[PDB]
Design an enzyme around this catalytic site. Structure first.
Site, PDB file in Angstrom:
ATOM      1  N   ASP A  88       0.841  -1.177   0.000  1.00  0.00           N
ATOM      2  CA  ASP A  88       0.000   0.000   0.000  1.00  0.00           C
ATOM      3  C   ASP A  88       0.905   1.266   0.000  1.00  0.00           C
ATOM      4  O   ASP A  88       2.129   1.154   0.290  1.00  0.00           O
ATOM      5  CB  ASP A  88      -0.952   0.019   1.202  1.00  0.00           C
ATOM      6  CG  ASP A  88      -1.668   1.298   1.559  1.00  0.00           C
ATOM      7  OD1 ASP A  88      -1.894   2.141   0.588  1.00  0.00           O
ATOM      8  OD2 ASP A  88      -2.042   1.603   2.709  1.00  0.00           O
ATOM      9  N   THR A 108      -0.251   4.972   1.085  1.00  0.00           N
ATOM     10  CA  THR A 108      -0.495   5.896   2.185  1.00  0.00           C
ATOM     11  C   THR A 108      -0.322   5.178   3.516  1.00  0.00           C
ATOM     12  O   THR A 108      -1.051   4.228   3.819  1.00  0.00           O
ATOM     13  CB  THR A 108      -1.893   6.496   2.074  1.00  0.00           C
ATOM     14  OG1 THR A 108      -1.903   7.491   1.046  1.00  0.00           O
ATOM     15  CG2 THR A 108      -2.299   7.143   3.383  1.00  0.00           C
TER      16      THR A 108
HETATM   17 MG   LIG Z   1      -2.611   2.867   4.135  1.00  0.00          MG
END
Ligand SMILES: [Mg+2]
Ligand SMILES: *[C@@H]1O[C@H](CO)[C@@H](O[C@@H]2O[C@H](CO)[C@@H](O[C@H]3O[C@H](CO[C@H]4O[C@H](CO[C@H]5O[C@H](CO)[C@@H](O)[C@H](O)[C@@H]5O)[C@@H](O)[C@H](O)[C@@H]4O)[C@@H](O)[C@H](O[C@H]4O[C@H](CO)[C@@H](O)[C@H](O)[C@@H]4O)[C@@H]3O)[C@H](O)[C@H]2NC(C)=O)[C@H](O)[C@H]1NC(C)=O
Ligand SMILES: *[C@@H]1O[C@H](CO)[C@@H](O[C@@H]2O[C@H](CO)[C@@H](O[C@H]3O[C@H](CO)[C@@H](O)[C@H](O[C@]4(O)O[C@H](CO)[C@@H](O)[C@H](O)[C@@H]4O)[C@@H]3O)[C@H](O)[C@H]2NC(C)=O)[C@H](O)[C@H]1NC(C)=O
Ligand SMILES: *[C@@H]1O[C@H](CO)[C@@H](O[C@@H]2O[C@H](CO)[C@@H](O)[C@H](O)[C@H]2NC(C)=O)[C@H](O)[C@H]1NC(C)=O
Ligand SMILES: *[C@@H]1O[C@H](CO)[C@@H](O)[C@H](O)[C@H]1NC(C)=O
Lengths: 338, 1183
Positions: B410, B412
């Site tokens: 991922d 963020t």
């Molecule tokens: Mg995240």
């Protein structure tokens, strides 16, 4: 400092001191040369020590047409009860047997290491516990009870099938003179632990071995109670030398067992040159399954018997070792930063 | 022809007003019998789930069945159970009472304890989220309460910075018009703030506790659906019920910001929330070595059966040729020879069963538990600031760490740390702030310049250009005093001064940085009431008045404002992307090429840029367009597009001012980690739910994709894939009659081709869209579809049309240097992972934090969760959890490959020590009439693999290491030998077995040759079974323990102690069993009495053991030496040359100042913000 930092010891961080061995080339070559040389020397020593030992056999089985004892080859009825067809056989010695002489008997095709056969014994009773004498174990199944239902004294198929031959040796002094018997030291022919720890006949009630074996019937195939195996109190019962020697089972289907040794007073050397006779007593039947019976006169050395296998094996291993040493040296030399 | 939007995150097309009826008060209303379902027994629970969360698997009383079912997935347990059943039949028992059951129970209970400790750990980890003390209305006022006792139908109250406990309907707050600001960084990876508007009717009624303790409203929402953005439904509050939509809903993993408090009605709870519908189907994970051990056990079972059958036939033949003729092997039985062979079959099965002994899964468990506890003791994996020790959570997936092929991560929160920090600007030509960029303090140090001349500096920014501030103080140029003022006027930030000192409530990360820089470069920004905003220019206050705010939009990509100064003069200020401004600028700007050629440098750095301009509107022409967009503002269906048309009318003659720059702040160590992992032949894919522009500066920043790399968005991919698939199958215009699909003619072999794909194009390429109701005919029945074998509706064969796009796409992504998927549903990430693991079968790792990575973490082969933050939704479903991305260096290149190596060494040695032991009875069988006689003592067979050889292998499987970790991170290539199954595959198992059989052959046939004839010295017990067995046994316990010394390459003290302890234990316990001491008081238990101290006292026996050891051990040394100076393996080469080598210190930036083939023309524009923040032009939501 910190409520959750680990302890930081040597083990917990995979930091224990450790010697790291790398298989160099200055360790392989000396190993395969020194070990090879040592193996060559040791094997040559073994080979020469295994060849200075003299043996003499007869194979006194009566199976074939030829043979003195063949005159009393039996059939399938059981004829030990009639005369034991005592045969004999003659020989001459041109030289000596310097060193004490050992006399063995050899059987072939006899599977004394069969699993069912080997476990058919009662070690507890045979030890000498005064309580276990009357109650043998269920393992000696076809040799546990009798026709009258009485317990048997040995409780086993190994003890039931015991070698019941005998031998005697005679020598002639002057040419034409009658033969005379020479002694056979029939004592101390087993391991010292076997007839002092393993086997002990039970304590004497009213002071007699016979009076402590009531109820215990002899094995079906014998002809004498266990306490009658020899007219000697110090050698009778579970500690009879022949009985204890027979019970130490063999590893292969062709074995020999110690019978006697000739070291007595008259001539504590080898057998002097001359003429000898041996009387045998053919009682053990072996021809039914195709066995054999042999007598063996021999001597010993530091290694033991007369096996040439192990010395030859050492020579082969040493030769292969040095050859692989040269091969490895050549490979190492031809390969450098390539 | 609705094309993919690539801005939408298609939460639709993923599935596979309807009486939910909450009526939030009077709990007992939901306890009615008809609402709640019925089960088989009286145990029927409900329809409305509780708010508790469960992650643990073993409940109070299903730990016995469920653990034993997964326990017998191992074949060896079926093997042991079959043997247990076999050994209980009376006709063949060969053993005493049931003492073969207890060891099985001990072995079967050790694993149960080990797998219960982990469950307890996660059961206490699950406790934290259930005790977070929200506030609920019990009967009267608000009272503090736990999260786990919130039920569907409860009025709740929340304060700022507090998590939202369940899906609630906002009904009141403490803000004007009662709206709330939330952030959703744990739902879809966005970083800007969203605004939820409460219903109007409840704003003017409740507003207070006492009225809140009165409510009768009904809700007729839908059933839990996993849509995250629709929520149809109504509200029967009273008197002509009011509808509802997604703008009045707060979800679970969201957190409140910039509002003191708010109230809400609970609608969903527990596993019914819209975020608990996305994580699904937790499974049972087995490593890749278990599937190998199963085949080992099956082949050993087959071998055992065949060998036992052969020996039984041999005994049958022997019995009625020589056996039933011997008067000394007599039995009371009358068994025919065939029955004798049938009985010896089972005897040999029992004798030779000790291949794969009972101590196989007791040592594996110890090894894996030890390595797992090594992982979380690592001081070099511990994060000092947040104080997290990087623990391991499963203790069973531990050798899988050294066989990874792919990593999915991922963006963020995993690669970034959510900081913006404005860096540099370019005003009228020259850029500003390199490090000194001046003449004064240009040859001084490179320390930070002070701002001790304002009341607003507050010491929060680090700037280094003394020239810029020096000129600003001097006032020697008015071209910059205008630029820095624009930053303070063109935004939507709201200020809420607590007490004197002013703080900024900015809805977007990209706007807070600019206003902060403006404030601490002078030019502060004071109150912003509704039409007039006040600016403190260098300490002098001024108040302008806003005429219009042309707001931000996604497809516009610019924002502007029109103001009037107190000197009676109107102006327009605009900022936005360069690629949209450069169609608007006035055609007289001299410094267009100067700034454009300076916009590349910024974009050549890994940072995001904006462009600024202004326009002189005078004070007359304005009015025409003013009433023009007055006419076009208030409308019915064109507020968002007619206003857009009137917007694009004063975007002409837009003379420049310069460009800015902002820099994301990934983490300490991400790019070095990516480089190291790329050297070790691992592939990294970034699957993010964030915007497309944002997930390009991250791609360039971590150097996944750099200069000289084509990007090739999905628009191109769909065309290329269609061209290759539709054409050149057996068609494509002109037929080929070959149409070979074997050549990977996707791209020419030039490498460095990235692949950036949006979720919508991900759906389009993969041939997966929802079908509207007006495309299918009817249901399944013989009216629409006739009798001719159901020719239309039952003949789908979409798998033919599919299963080719999927495989083709997976093979297309095989030859790209980096793949980045942006704006993806939580389900689509797991979809991609499963696609990559279905074709081109590979081992996958998935790492990421937040609640939108739970599905992907569960579905991959290994799931790592990032911890140390506040939201821990991805940590409770993971397998390992450290606190920084860079620690991935040590979890793979140190722990994983060491663990794989040690397990492979253990498995290679175990199946060698076991055949050398058992396979001696087989060779012995030819010399005793195939009677199943053993060649060892009775007490040696039950103590061999328990005492004599069990500790050295454990110590080697724990403590061994190939090379130290100080230089195991310097050479990541060493990973490769584990990635391709080159240390232990099926072909090597049959070599270990061959070593075993040769060792058993040479251990039996040398002592037999020596024992053929007499061996007595002076007691003359000629060759006998007891001495033979002692000789064979004592020459195995030495070779099997010298061999383990030729395997260990890390000789600690405890290793040597263990080896010689094993040898000495064997000898010193043998001299105790074979003794006159315990013959008394234990007569019929120890068969071999007095033989050990009577056979081992003669040289001939010792000359037999030495030869056997030297023969079954010396050619192994020869082979090793002859296979090391001809084919030195990589680790051998490293260890040989370690004495003299240079140090290393690298990874500066890979500076690339300019290229001689300038081709990019790609702008690093990125702005994280939404639409509709023009509420100010409606009314002043200030106080
Ligand atoms: Mg995240
Ligand atoms: C040196 O050692 C050897 C050891 O090999 C001795 O030779 C053995 O000596 C045994 C005597 O101690 C002798 O055992 C018996 O032999 C005869 C038995 O044969 C009878 O049965 C045969 C059928 O066999 C089956 O019969 C039984 C019962 O019917 C079945 O249940 C069973 O399945 C048998 O397979 C017939 O074919 C024969 O014709 C004969 O009928 C008998 O002379 C003896 O049997 C006893 O019978 C009753 C039972 O209650 C007794 O009360 C009675 O007194 C008899 O003793 C005898 O026990 C072995 O045959 C013989 N040879 C071997 C074993 O090869 C030497 O004697 C020894 N020499 C020494 C010490 O100098
Ligand atoms: C070689 O092979 C032959 C034949 O294959 C074997 O001869 C067989 O011996 C068996 C052992 O006894 C015989 O079984 C039966 O023997 C008698 C016969 O009437 C019978 O009474 C047995 O029943 C008992 O075992 O008898 C005892 C007697 O007291 C009872 O107490 C007990 O409870 C049982 O009732 C038994 O059923 C078998 O008959 C015989 N074969 C033939 C064809 O007769 C040899 O033993 C083998 N071994 C050698 C020769 O060494
Ligand atoms: C047993 O064998 C020996 C020789 O192997 C036989 O001994 C000879 O016997 C004959 C007559 O029986 C004598 O004339 C010879 O002088 C003997 N040889 C010598 C003394 O060396 C013996 O006869 C055999 N026993 C038999 C056949 O019963
Ligand atoms: C020994 O053999 C000779 C030869 O016949 C003879 O004296 C007799 O048979 C045997 N004597 C004894 C005591 O066995």
């Amino acid at each position: 400092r910190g409520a959750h930092q680990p302890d930081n010891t040597a083990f917990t961080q995979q930091r224990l001191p450790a010697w790291q061995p790398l298989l160099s080339a200055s360790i392989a070559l000396p190993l395969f040369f020194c070990a090879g040389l040592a193996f060559i020397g040791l094997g040559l020593g073994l080979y020469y020590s295994s060849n200075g030992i003299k043996e003499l056999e007869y194979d006194y089985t009566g199976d074939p047409g030829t043979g003195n004892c063949s005159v009393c080859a039996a059939a399938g009825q059981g004829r030990a009860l009639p005369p034991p067809c005592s045969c004999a056989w003659y020989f001459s010695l041109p030289e000596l047997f310097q060193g004490p002489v050992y006399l063995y008997y050899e059987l072939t095709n006899f599977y004394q290491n069969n699993r069912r056969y080997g476990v058919s014994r009662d070690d507890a009773q045979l030890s000498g516990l005064p309580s276990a004498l009357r109650h043998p174990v269920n393992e000696c199944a076809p040799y546990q009870r009798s026709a009258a239902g009485l317990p048997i004294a040995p409780c086993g198929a190994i003890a039931n099938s015991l070698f019941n031959d005998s031998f005697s040796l005679w020598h002639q002094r002057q040419p034409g003179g009658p033969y005379v018997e020479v002694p056979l030291d029939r004592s101390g022919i087993a391991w010292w632990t076997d007839y002092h720890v393993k086997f002990r006949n039970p304590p004497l009630v009213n002071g007699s071995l016979a009076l402590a074996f009531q109820g215990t019937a002899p094995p079906p195939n014998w002809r004498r109670p266990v306490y009658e195996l020899s007219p000697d109190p110090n050698n009778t019962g579970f500690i009879n030398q022949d009985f204890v020697v027979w019970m130490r089972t063999a590893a292969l289907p062709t074995f020999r067992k110690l019978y006697a040794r000739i070291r007595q007073g008259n001539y504590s050397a080898g057998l002097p040159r001359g003429a000898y006779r041996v009387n045998i007593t053919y009682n053990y039947p072996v021809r039914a399954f195709g066995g054999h019976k042999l007598l063996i006169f021999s001597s010993i050395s530091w290694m033991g018997g007369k096996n040439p296998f192990l010395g030859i094996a050492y020579l082969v291993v040493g030769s292969l070792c040095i050859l692989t040493g040269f091969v490895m040296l050549v490979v190492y030399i031809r390969y450098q930063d390539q | 022809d609705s094309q993919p939007n690539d801005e939408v995150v298609p939460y639709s097309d993923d599935e596979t007003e309807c009486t939910w009826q909450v009526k939030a008060n009077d709990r007992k209303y939901h306890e009615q019998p008809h609402f709640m379902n019925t089960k088989f027994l009286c145990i029927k629970e409900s329809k409305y789930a509780n708010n508790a969360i469960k992650t643990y698997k073993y409940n109070a009383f299903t730990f016995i069945p469920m653990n034993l079912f997964e326990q017998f997935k191992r074949a060896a347990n079926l093997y042991f159970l079959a043997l247990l059943i076999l050994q209980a039949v009376p006709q063949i028992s060969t053993l005493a009472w049931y003492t073969t059951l207890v060891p099985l129970l001990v072995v079967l209970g050790v694993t149960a304890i080990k797998d219960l400790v982990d469950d307890v750990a996660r059961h206490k980890m699950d406790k934290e989220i259930n005790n977070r003390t929200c506030e609920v209305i019990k009967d009267g006022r608000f009272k503090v309460a736990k999260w786990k006792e919130i039920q569907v139908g409860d009025v709740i109250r929340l304060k700022k910075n507090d998590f939202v406990p369940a899906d609630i309907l906002l009904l009141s707050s403490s803000e004007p018009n009662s709206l709330c600001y939330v952030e959703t960084a744990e739902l879809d990876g966005e970083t800007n703030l969203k605004f939820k508007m409460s219903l109007e009717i409840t704003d003017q009624y409740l507003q207070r506790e006492d009225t809140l303790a009165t409510f009768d409203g009904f809700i007729e929402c839908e059933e839990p659906n996993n849509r995250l953005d629709k929520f149809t439904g109504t509200l029967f509050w009273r008197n002509t019920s009011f509808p509802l939509d997604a703008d009045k809903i707060l979800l679970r993993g969201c957190v409140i910001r910039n509002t003191d408090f708010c109230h809400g009605l609970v609608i969903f709870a527990g596993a019914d929330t819209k975020i608990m519908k996305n994580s699904g189907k937790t499974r049972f994970k087995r490593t890749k070595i278990d599937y190998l051990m199963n085949y080992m056990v099956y082949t050993i079972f087959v071998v055992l059966i065949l060998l036992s059958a052969g020996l039984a036939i041999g005994h049958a033949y022997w019995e009625a040729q020589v056996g039933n003729s011997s008067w000394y092997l007599y039995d009371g039985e009358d068994d025919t020879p065939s029955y004798r062979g049938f009985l010896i079959f089972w005897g040999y099965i029992i004798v030779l069963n000790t291949m794969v002994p009972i101590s196989l899964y007791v040592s594996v468990e110890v090894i894996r538990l030890g390595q797992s506890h090594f992982i979380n003791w690592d001081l070099q994996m511990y994060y000092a600031e947040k104080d997290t020790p990087a623990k391991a959570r499963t203790t069973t997936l531990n050798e899988q760490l050294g066989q990874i092929h792919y990593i999915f991560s991922d963006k963020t929160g995993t690669l970034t740390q959510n900081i913006m920090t404005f860096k540099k600007c370019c005003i009228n030509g020259q850029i500003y702030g390199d490090h000194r960029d001046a003449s004064q303090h240009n040859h001084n140090k490179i320390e930070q310049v002070d701002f001790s001349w304002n009341t607003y500096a507050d010491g929060k920014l680090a700037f280094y250009d003394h020239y810029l501030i020096e000129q600003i103080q001097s006032g020697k140029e008015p071209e910059v005093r205008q630029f820095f003022f624009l930053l303070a006027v063109c935004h939507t930030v709201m200020v809420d001064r607590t007490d004197g000192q002013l703080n900024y409530q900015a809805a977007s990360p990209d706007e807070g940085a600019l206003v902060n820089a403006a404030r601490n470069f002078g030019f502060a920004f004071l109150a912003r009431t509704q039409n007039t905003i006040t600016i403190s220019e260098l300490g002098t206050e001024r108040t302008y008045n806003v005429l219009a705010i042309l707001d931000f939009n996604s497809d516009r990509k610019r924002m502007s404002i029109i103001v009037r100064t107190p000197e009676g003069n109107i102006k327009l200020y605009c900022k936005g992307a360069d690629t949209v401004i450069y169609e608007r600028l006035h055609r007289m700007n001299p410094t267009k090429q100067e700034t454009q050629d300076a916009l590349d440098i910024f974009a050549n750095e890994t940072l995001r840029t904006l462009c600024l301009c202004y326009k002189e509107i005078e004070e007359k022409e304005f009015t025409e367009w003013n009433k023009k967009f007055m006419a076009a503002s208030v409308a019915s269906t064109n507020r968002d597009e007619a206003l857009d048309k009137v917007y694009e009318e004063i975007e002409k003659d837009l003379i420049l001012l310069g460009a800015t720059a902002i820099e994301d702040k990934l983490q300490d160590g991400v790019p070095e980690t990516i480089s190291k992992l790329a050297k070790a032949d691992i592939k990294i894919w970034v699957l993010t739910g964030d915007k497309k522009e944002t997930a390009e500066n991250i791609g360039f920043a971590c150097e996944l994709l750099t200069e000289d790399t084509t990007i090739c968005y999905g628009e191109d991919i769909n065309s290329l894939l269609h061209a290759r698939m539709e054409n050149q199958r057996n068609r494509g215009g002109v037929y080929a009659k070959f149409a070979p699909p074997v050549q990977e003619s996707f791209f020419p072999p030039g490498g460095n081709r990235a692949l950036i794909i949006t979720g919508s194009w991900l759906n389009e390429i993969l041939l997966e869209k929802k079908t509207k109701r007006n495309k299918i005919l009817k249901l399944k029945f013989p009216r629409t579809e006739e009798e001719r074998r159901m020719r239309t509706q039952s003949k789908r064969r979409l798998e033919a049309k599919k299963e080719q796009r999927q495989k083709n796409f997976v093979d297309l992504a095989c030859e790209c240097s980096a793949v980045i998927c942006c704006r993806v549903t939580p389900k689509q990430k797991a979809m991609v992972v499963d696609l990559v693991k279905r074709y081109k079968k590979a081992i996958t790792l998935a790492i990421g934090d937040g609640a939108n990575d739970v599905n992907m973490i569960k579905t991959a082969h290994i799931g790592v969760g990032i911890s140390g933050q506040e939201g821990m939704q991805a940590v409770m479903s993971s397998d390992y959890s450290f606190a920084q991305f860079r620690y991935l260096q040590r979890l793979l290149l140190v722990h994983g490959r060491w663990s794989y190596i040690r397990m492979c060494k253990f498995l290679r040695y175990f199946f060698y020590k076991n055949f050398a032991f058992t396979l001696v009875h087989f060779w012995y069988s030819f010399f005793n009439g195939y009677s199943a006689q053993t060649a060892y003592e009775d007490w040696f067979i039950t103590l061999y693999n328990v005492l004599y050889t069990s500790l050295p292998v454990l110590l080697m499987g724990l403590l061994d290491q190939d090379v130290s970790d100080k230089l195991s991170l310097r050479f990541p290539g060493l990973y490769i030998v584990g990635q391709r199954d080159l240390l232990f595959n099926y072909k090597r198992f049959f070599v270990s077995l061959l070593h075993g059989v040769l060792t058993s052959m040479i251990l039996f046939f040398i002592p037999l040759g020596a024992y053929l004839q007499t061996v007595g010295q002076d007691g003359e017990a000629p060759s006998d079974y007891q001495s033979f067995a002692v000789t064979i046994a004592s020459a195995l316990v030495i070779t099997v323990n010298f061999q383990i010394g030729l395997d260990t390459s890390y000789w600690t003290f405890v290793n040597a102690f263990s080896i010689f302890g094993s040898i000495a234990l064997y000898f010193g316990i043998m001299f105790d069993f074979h003794s006159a001491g315990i013959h008394v008081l234990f007569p019929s238990a120890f068969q071999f009495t007095g033989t050990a101290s009577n056979a081992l006292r003669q040289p001939y026996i010792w000359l037999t053991i030495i030869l056997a050891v030297a023969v079954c051990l010396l050619p192994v040394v020869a082979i090793r030496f002859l296979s090391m100076t001809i084919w030195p393996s990589e680790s051998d080469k490293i260890q040989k040359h370690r004495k003299r080598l240079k140090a290393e210190e690298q990874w500066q930036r890979r500076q690339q100042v300019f290229r001689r083939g300038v081709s990019t023309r790609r702008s690093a524009y990125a702005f994280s913000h939404q639409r509709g923040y023009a509420d100010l032009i409606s009314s002043g939501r200030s106080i």
